[PDB]
Amino acid sequence: GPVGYSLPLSPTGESAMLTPPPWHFSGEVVMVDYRVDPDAARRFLPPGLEPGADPGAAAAVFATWQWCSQDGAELTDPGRCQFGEFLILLSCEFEGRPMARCPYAWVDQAVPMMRGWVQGMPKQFGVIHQSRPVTVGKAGSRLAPGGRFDGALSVHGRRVVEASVTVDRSTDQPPALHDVPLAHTLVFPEWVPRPRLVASEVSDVEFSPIWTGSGDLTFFDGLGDDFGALAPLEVGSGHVFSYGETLHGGRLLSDYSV
Amino acid sequence: GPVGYSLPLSPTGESAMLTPPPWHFSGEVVMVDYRVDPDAARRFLPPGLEPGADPGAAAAVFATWQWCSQDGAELTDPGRCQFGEFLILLSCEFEGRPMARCPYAWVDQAVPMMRGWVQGMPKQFGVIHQSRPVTVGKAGSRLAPGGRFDGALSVHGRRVVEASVTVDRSTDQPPALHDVPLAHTLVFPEWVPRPRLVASEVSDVEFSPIWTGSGDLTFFDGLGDDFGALAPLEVGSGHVFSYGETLHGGRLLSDYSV
Amino acid sequence: HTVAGPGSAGPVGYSLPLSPTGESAMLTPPPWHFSGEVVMVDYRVDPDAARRFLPPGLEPGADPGAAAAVFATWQWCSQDGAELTDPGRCQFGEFLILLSCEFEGRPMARCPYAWVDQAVPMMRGWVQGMPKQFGVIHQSRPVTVGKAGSRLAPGGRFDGALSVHGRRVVEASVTVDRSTDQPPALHDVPLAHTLVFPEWVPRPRLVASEVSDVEFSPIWTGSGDLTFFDGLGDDFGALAPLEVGSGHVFSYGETLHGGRLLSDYS
Amino acid sequence: HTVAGPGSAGPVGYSLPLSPTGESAMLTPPPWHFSGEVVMVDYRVDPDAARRFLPPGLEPGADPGAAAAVFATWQWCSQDGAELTDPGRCQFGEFLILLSCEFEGRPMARCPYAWVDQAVPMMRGWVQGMPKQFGVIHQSRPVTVGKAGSRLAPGGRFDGALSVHGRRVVEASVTVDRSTDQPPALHDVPLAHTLVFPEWVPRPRLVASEVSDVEFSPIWTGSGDLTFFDGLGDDFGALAPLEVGSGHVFSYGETLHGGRLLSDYS
């Protein structure tokens, strides 16, 4: 019968929408650390995932990614290997180890959306805009003190998040929530339901120098009251940097069996 | 902990991308029946699904849909309740009962894509164009003898299917492959794998008068050799009609257990 | 040199890009035929605000406060019908504002703002003086089978929405009650546009679009709802509804031929 | 009446839509600043075919067969920089063909075809005579961390693709070998355009775009590859490569001010 890593199944397996991991990623990030209501954050954490050592720590993350499979084949089709993304990250712990929970994420390409659900990452579809550094001319900012970088998310035609970073300095200190394991819930609707708590296993994590400065972040109505509960109480530092990793698969944290 | 019919989980369950079934559909269809190589068709049928009483019968189906949940809430946001689709259908049987297998499908909205995978329908993302009947002016065709209606699919920026129907007459005979149960394979990649063969349960199936005439159908390179194997040997009748149904859930055909 | 014509040298075309045979041109010469589906809401505008969008030569409407918000989806083609076989090339959606005005005692409509979702109609709009910009436009379509939508029948509801640069800026709804053969007033009068294009190295002209073979389906009418939201600026905001009137759902056809000069201001 | 200026009556603006304050206009007055990333392939074109795209006044290039296929992504803003805070408003991608030509002994480039993926740049292109249509344009970006891409270093590969109306019509690749400070010839000369807009109720002018503060990063050069596919018509097809030369990857900036008249054909 037909086969494949994913649908659609086909006689040779080549038609599958997704390729088996590992996948490599190289991206550009614009990120704002912020303070969330810890009581609201707790309600997005499933059983086994406990409040951060700093329960109020969150982040809003804009990124643009290029990705490919182990053979690098997607790289020659920039239309197939690129996507933009906006995510929320919440600080948490599993058995005393710091992690990040991603309660919400939006992307602008279908393959990364479906591949997100594969790993338990709750990706939906949206329109994501992000400033890029320039090195010539005047139409933009440089990676240098005073440089400003903006991000915006619209979902279903409504502008729901805007963020800005004005950088002051370069550091080798990665933003905390972008240098911990991500703990997701693997679950898929039952058509004819055993959620599992899992962590994504990554290797070869690499950061450019991090440009950091002041952050600004605003949420707007249009995603519902549940999302609104994660709006910033206060906004902290912003970071602009490049990031790479190899994403290998999942490790089971808990299947909630007894 | 947070809940929901699907990701993202949230404290009240409202953030979920998908709503529980049943879902209602009302659509406009442009469909071409064609002859496929029966040996190529057989290779797309999983265990338990056997060749049609007419193994060579296939169809190419363009449709535009409006859909909503039981409460009808999506209908007031046309941007959320509409999508376009192109599908291939192959004739098959399960335990002596005629069904259709959908080996390939493309849609232009994320919610229907993910909801397709929920039901085992192998939807990917593409750009789908479809002619619409007009009732005034000269810029189009009427639902009347001589009226022509076109469909086109581009995937990753490549034009891969084009079809046309010129209708001759109205009938009350639904196209065979659009009036049988659909048999899908429920399977999702294993991140840390028990495919199931299922049929979609529908009710309240309704057709407009069917306008039927000559069909034309062309495949072009750009989807791979596996897809190419399903190219038409011969092209038969085309049909233009409206269609409604309520989609309730799955029934298990086989879980391949022993 | 740019007109295909006797002894012409350079490349030619009705529009850019010019090419040796003229086939490359983005636009085709008129006439163009249109067949569309409309969801329209009549509303009351501040007449003093409306007046400031009317160029010299155009006087306030017989009812100066009469306006309309118009959602439409179109199919179009040139005389040879060639575009109709490529639905991806011959379809677009649109949202327009219309204001009641008059030229020398004759009712017309001014379109101060329009958004479309395809480039060819956008440019062709500028050619005729219609001020089209790009946006995302959604519109309900009647259904005839199933439950997922409304029928053209009493109680049927039809919605429209416009987003521009990722902000939701107009939402409209009509719930129809009854059918009539009375076309909405602002959809059955000449449109008066201003022809002007930026100077790179301007002399505006007031023109009317000449159309023929105007055709309406039966008109389904009932209550309208209309809301403007921030994101298009205060100039646009001045045209927000004071009160919202009847909504209309109908099909429309016409042939558009070219422009007639109302004034070149000499 | 359409210029904001002393005693002006009607609505005003640099372009449509006109409005009481002029704020609604789709376009802003120049100058505009550009900062971009380019992936370009030099190629050999049929010189006799190229000649037919050159209007009177423009002579064949010193090397008549020299052409280029250019992929670029841009950020742009007006003098006040206001657009830069809305990345969704200030970015676009582009694919262009360039042909070598001369005006009165001076090297220039003719752009017979261009496609962009945003409406404002499309219209602003027509304003300056650059024949821009709408398309989908993809372009590799260098990476500096990780494995999912190429570095600006020997062996780095960068790709570009154009689809128009859902058909894949151009694909290009560069594999870079070495860095240089020598800008690609067709990206460091004035562009000579034809100003023409359809008449609704045409007098073309040959113009050059005036730019300042032209700036190149170091240029990464190596082998180029370039393939045209059917779907843009035979006029465009005539410009397909006979042979493909060097590819170049670099960053580019300039300020664009306005047009200079080369000939109004009087």
PDB file of N, CA, C and O in Angstrom, chain A residues 79, chain B residues 127 156-157, chain D residues 71 93-95 115-117 133-139 161-170:
ATOM      1  N   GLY A  79      11.063  29.775  -2.142  1.00  0.00           N
ATOM      2  CA  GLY A  79       9.631  29.764  -1.918  1.00  0.00           C
ATOM      3  C   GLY A  79       9.142  28.613  -1.049  1.00  0.00           C
ATOM      4  O   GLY A  79       8.062  28.703  -0.474  1.00  0.00           O
TER       5      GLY A  79
ATOM      6  N   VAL B 127      -3.086  27.370  -4.703  1.00  0.00           N
ATOM      7  CA  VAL B 127      -3.903  28.462  -5.241  1.00  0.00           C
ATOM      8  C   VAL B 127      -4.868  27.884  -6.280  1.00  0.00           C
ATOM      9  O   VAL B 127      -4.435  27.241  -7.252  1.00  0.00           O
ATOM     10  N   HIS B 156       2.980  25.783  -5.195  1.00  0.00           N
ATOM     11  CA  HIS B 156       4.344  26.353  -5.149  1.00  0.00           C
ATOM     12  C   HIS B 156       4.706  27.150  -6.399  1.00  0.00           C
ATOM     13  O   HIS B 156       5.848  27.140  -6.882  1.00  0.00           O
ATOM     14  N   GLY B 157       3.727  27.881  -6.920  1.00  0.00           N
ATOM     15  CA  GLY B 157       4.009  28.785  -7.982  1.00  0.00           C
ATOM     16  C   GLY B 157       4.069  28.121  -9.350  1.00  0.00           C
ATOM     17  O   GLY B 157       4.481  28.768 -10.320  1.00  0.00           O
TER      18      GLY B 157
ATOM     19  N   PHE D  71      17.037  39.980  -9.272  1.00  0.00           N
ATOM     20  CA  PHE D  71      16.144  39.762  -8.150  1.00  0.00           C
ATOM     21  C   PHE D  71      16.577  40.699  -7.022  1.00  0.00           C
ATOM     22  O   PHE D  71      17.755  40.792  -6.700  1.00  0.00           O
ATOM     23  N   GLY D  93       9.461  42.851  -2.808  1.00  0.00           N
ATOM     24  CA  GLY D  93      10.356  42.097  -3.667  1.00  0.00           C
ATOM     25  C   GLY D  93      10.124  42.389  -5.138  1.00  0.00           C
ATOM     26  O   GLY D  93       9.035  42.831  -5.536  1.00  0.00           O
ATOM     27  N   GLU D  94      11.145  42.115  -5.958  1.00  0.00           N
ATOM     28  CA  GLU D  94      11.135  42.534  -7.331  1.00  0.00           C
ATOM     29  C   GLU D  94      11.973  41.620  -8.204  1.00  0.00           C
ATOM     30  O   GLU D  94      12.966  41.054  -7.750  1.00  0.00           O
ATOM     31  N   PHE D  95      11.519  41.423  -9.436  1.00  0.00           N
ATOM     32  CA  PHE D  95      12.343  40.881 -10.505  1.00  0.00           C
ATOM     33  C   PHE D  95      12.316  41.777 -11.743  1.00  0.00           C
ATOM     34  O   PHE D  95      11.237  42.227 -12.183  1.00  0.00           O
ATOM     35  N   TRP D 115       8.555  42.906 -12.352  1.00  0.00           N
ATOM     36  CA  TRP D 115       7.425  42.458 -11.539  1.00  0.00           C
ATOM     37  C   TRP D 115       7.751  42.736 -10.077  1.00  0.00           C
ATOM     38  O   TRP D 115       8.901  42.582  -9.638  1.00  0.00           O
ATOM     39  N   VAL D 116       6.731  43.151  -9.339  1.00  0.00           N
ATOM     40  CA  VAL D 116       6.852  43.380  -7.919  1.00  0.00           C
ATOM     41  C   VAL D 116       5.682  42.739  -7.196  1.00  0.00           C
ATOM     42  O   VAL D 116       4.704  42.310  -7.842  1.00  0.00           O
ATOM     43  N   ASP D 117       5.781  42.679  -5.872  1.00  0.00           N
ATOM     44  CA  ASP D 117       4.765  42.004  -5.065  1.00  0.00           C
ATOM     45  C   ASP D 117       4.010  42.929  -4.104  1.00  0.00           C
ATOM     46  O   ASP D 117       3.300  42.475  -3.179  1.00  0.00           O
ATOM     47  N   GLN D 133       4.633  45.123 -13.280  1.00  0.00           N
ATOM     48  CA  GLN D 133       3.407  44.348 -13.121  1.00  0.00           C
ATOM     49  C   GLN D 133       3.508  43.541 -11.821  1.00  0.00           C
ATOM     50  O   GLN D 133       4.507  43.624 -11.122  1.00  0.00           O
ATOM     51  N   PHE D 134       2.472  42.772 -11.487  1.00  0.00           N
ATOM     52  CA  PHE D 134       2.428  42.093 -10.204  1.00  0.00           C
ATOM     53  C   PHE D 134       2.856  40.624 -10.379  1.00  0.00           C
ATOM     54  O   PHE D 134       2.449  39.964 -11.354  1.00  0.00           O
ATOM     55  N   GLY D 135       3.640  40.118  -9.433  1.00  0.00           N
ATOM     56  CA  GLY D 135       4.034  38.725  -9.436  1.00  0.00           C
ATOM     57  C   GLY D 135       4.451  38.219  -8.061  1.00  0.00           C
ATOM     58  O   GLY D 135       4.399  38.939  -7.066  1.00  0.00           O
ATOM     59  N   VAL D 136       4.872  36.959  -8.014  1.00  0.00           N
ATOM     60  CA  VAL D 136       5.350  36.352  -6.791  1.00  0.00           C
ATOM     61  C   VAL D 136       6.842  36.078  -7.003  1.00  0.00           C
ATOM     62  O   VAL D 136       7.220  35.381  -7.946  1.00  0.00           O
ATOM     63  N   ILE D 137       7.661  36.630  -6.104  1.00  0.00           N
ATOM     64  CA  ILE D 137       9.089  36.639  -6.274  1.00  0.00           C
ATOM     65  C   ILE D 137       9.751  36.083  -5.026  1.00  0.00           C
ATOM     66  O   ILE D 137       9.525  36.588  -3.923  1.00  0.00           O
ATOM     67  N   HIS D 138      10.573  35.056  -5.219  1.00  0.00           N
ATOM     68  CA  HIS D 138      11.300  34.421  -4.119  1.00  0.00           C
ATOM     69  C   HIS D 138      12.801  34.616  -4.289  1.00  0.00           C
ATOM     70  O   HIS D 138      13.304  34.601  -5.418  1.00  0.00           O
ATOM     71  N   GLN D 139      13.510  34.775  -3.168  1.00  0.00           N
ATOM     72  CA  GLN D 139      14.934  35.057  -3.187  1.00  0.00           C
ATOM     73  C   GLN D 139      15.599  34.543  -1.915  1.00  0.00           C
ATOM     74  O   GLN D 139      15.114  34.795  -0.817  1.00  0.00           O
ATOM     75  N   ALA D 161      13.365  33.030  -7.933  1.00  0.00           N
ATOM     76  CA  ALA D 161      12.292  32.507  -8.779  1.00  0.00           C
ATOM     77  C   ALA D 161      11.174  33.530  -8.904  1.00  0.00           C
ATOM     78  O   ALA D 161      10.848  34.238  -7.941  1.00  0.00           O
ATOM     79  N   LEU D 162      10.579  33.563 -10.092  1.00  0.00           N
ATOM     80  CA  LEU D 162       9.418  34.416 -10.380  1.00  0.00           C
ATOM     81  C   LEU D 162       8.275  33.572 -10.910  1.00  0.00           C
ATOM     82  O   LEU D 162       8.480  32.792 -11.840  1.00  0.00           O
ATOM     83  N   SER D 163       7.091  33.735 -10.315  1.00  0.00           N
ATOM     84  CA  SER D 163       5.854  33.216 -10.879  1.00  0.00           C
ATOM     85  C   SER D 163       4.906  34.365 -11.152  1.00  0.00           C
ATOM     86  O   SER D 163       4.776  35.295 -10.354  1.00  0.00           O
ATOM     87  N   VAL D 164       4.259  34.291 -12.297  1.00  0.00           N
ATOM     88  CA  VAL D 164       3.292  35.302 -12.709  1.00  0.00           C
ATOM     89  C   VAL D 164       2.011  34.582 -13.111  1.00  0.00           C
ATOM     90  O   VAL D 164       2.044  33.640 -13.895  1.00  0.00           O
ATOM     91  N   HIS D 165       0.882  35.012 -12.550  1.00  0.00           N
ATOM     92  CA  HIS D 165      -0.391  34.335 -12.756  1.00  0.00           C
ATOM     93  C   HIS D 165      -0.285  32.827 -12.554  1.00  0.00           C
ATOM     94  O   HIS D 165      -0.888  32.044 -13.303  1.00  0.00           O
ATOM     95  N   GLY D 166       0.448  32.427 -11.520  1.00  0.00           N
ATOM     96  CA  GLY D 166       0.519  31.034 -11.112  1.00  0.00           C
ATOM     97  C   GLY D 166       1.381  30.120 -11.978  1.00  0.00           C
ATOM     98  O   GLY D 166       1.329  28.897 -11.827  1.00  0.00           O
ATOM     99  N   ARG D 167       2.181  30.720 -12.861  1.00  0.00           N
ATOM    100  CA  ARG D 167       3.125  30.001 -13.705  1.00  0.00           C
ATOM    101  C   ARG D 167       4.556  30.411 -13.405  1.00  0.00           C
ATOM    102  O   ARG D 167       4.870  31.604 -13.280  1.00  0.00           O
ATOM    103  N   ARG D 168       5.433  29.420 -13.292  1.00  0.00           N
ATOM    104  CA  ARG D 168       6.821  29.671 -12.947  1.00  0.00           C
ATOM    105  C   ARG D 168       7.539  30.054 -14.219  1.00  0.00           C
ATOM    106  O   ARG D 168       7.644  29.230 -15.125  1.00  0.00           O
ATOM    107  N   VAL D 169       8.006  31.299 -14.301  1.00  0.00           N
ATOM    108  CA  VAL D 169       8.522  31.823 -15.573  1.00  0.00           C
ATOM    109  C   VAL D 169      10.016  32.181 -15.621  1.00  0.00           C
ATOM    110  O   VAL D 169      10.580  32.250 -16.701  1.00  0.00           O
ATOM    111  N   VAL D 170      10.646  32.396 -14.466  1.00  0.00           N
ATOM    112  CA  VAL D 170      12.091  32.617 -14.423  1.00  0.00           C
ATOM    113  C   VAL D 170      12.679  31.964 -13.180  1.00  0.00           C
ATOM    114  O   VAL D 170      12.106  32.064 -12.088  1.00  0.00           O
TER     115      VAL D 170
END
